[PDB]
Amino acid sequence: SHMPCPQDWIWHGENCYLFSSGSFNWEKSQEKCLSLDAKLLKINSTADLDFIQQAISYSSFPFWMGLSRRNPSYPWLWEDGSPLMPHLFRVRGAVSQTYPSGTCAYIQRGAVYAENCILAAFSICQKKANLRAQ
């Protein structure tokens, strides 16, 4: 109970969050989080969204999250294959197009945008905190 999260991460709720250092395309951002035994940000509730919007209010830049879609006939899914809960947010940006490497979502000034996954952006990683979960 004394060390929920490592240094340089942010503890919130049952998880730890990391501003990853690099600016990379979505696939490389995914690999970076996985290399840390973590995953790209998964917004699971309105409380999570509120937390992230507050946590990024010091920055105007985009941050990749773990949401992607091969083309518009597929659902938006998190990396674990679960869907975007429809009450959380409405993806803006490049929602009609199809790109060779897929479309991915980032958050920027609290709003969520679709973009060609080849864009280099910052990303947020998360992992479970070292505590006894409910």
Added chain:
Amino acid sequence: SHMPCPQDWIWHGENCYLFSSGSFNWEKSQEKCLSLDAKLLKINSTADLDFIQQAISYSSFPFWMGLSRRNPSYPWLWEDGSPLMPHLFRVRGAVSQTYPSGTCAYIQRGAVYAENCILAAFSICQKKANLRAQ
């Protein structure tokens, strides 16, 4: 409740860091940090500066730190009354003006600027981490 830092703060070393939610004058920024049992950022060492430069790499905004003086007849001091270590950074900007409410310093894009304290910036709060349970 004996972990290093509260939820939402970044734990680094001996300290916990919090980015402000918005842009305010130095006095209001100082009071926010005090309300959190914290102070505005103090940069003690090159290692602290390296950490801060990385932490603000995600932003183009200015961030007040706890460095101020009333006019050029005074030394630059942190809120705790201790002096600035001069090797850390050049203080750019308005160093030699006398302003009615003093001159204060912010960091922006890794560079430190003196500015009239009544103008607004984001800010970084700092407080000592609780490490005895580690």
